[PDB]
Design a protein around this ligand. Structure first.
Ligand code: 35T
Length: 92
């Protein structure tokens, strides 16, 4: 992933904002760097990812799964993750 993508400005849709607000401050605009940071922290706070289980995030029992439209995914497949995140925001 190119470093410049981290500076991309986005506006999370309602339900993704709901998720982001349990770990970060509400903002009109976020950078992708922030969105990934917060999503990563959120994932850990709800036990969706455990280090002992091989890079897979299980989210079928959480709002994250609803938004990403998948029951689980690899933390190593970054391009896919970005695609899943773009389903839930509007670019500024
Ligand atoms: C270390 C990493 C996996 C890896 O590349 O080896 C990085 C990952 C990440 C970071 C930046 C962009 C992207 Cl697309 C993914 C990132 C991540 C962030 C958001 C999503 Cl949606 C998916 C994966 N996480 C989370 C933990 S973490 O890096 O936030 N943090 C490290 C120590 C404890 C918490 C995994 C939990 C979701 C990872 O485990």
């Amino acid at each position: 992933i190119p470093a410049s993508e981290q500076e991309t400005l986005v506006r999370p849709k309602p339900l993704l904002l709901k998720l982001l607000k349990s770990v970060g401050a509400q903002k009109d605009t976020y950078t992708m760097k922030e969105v990934l940071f917060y999503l990563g922290q959120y994932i850990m706070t709800k036990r969706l990812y455990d280090e002992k289980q091989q890079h897979i995030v299980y989210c079928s029992n959480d709002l994250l799964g609803d938004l990403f439209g998948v029951p689980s995914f690899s933390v190593k497949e970054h391009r896919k993750i970005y695609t899943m995140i773009y389903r839930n925001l509007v670019v500024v």
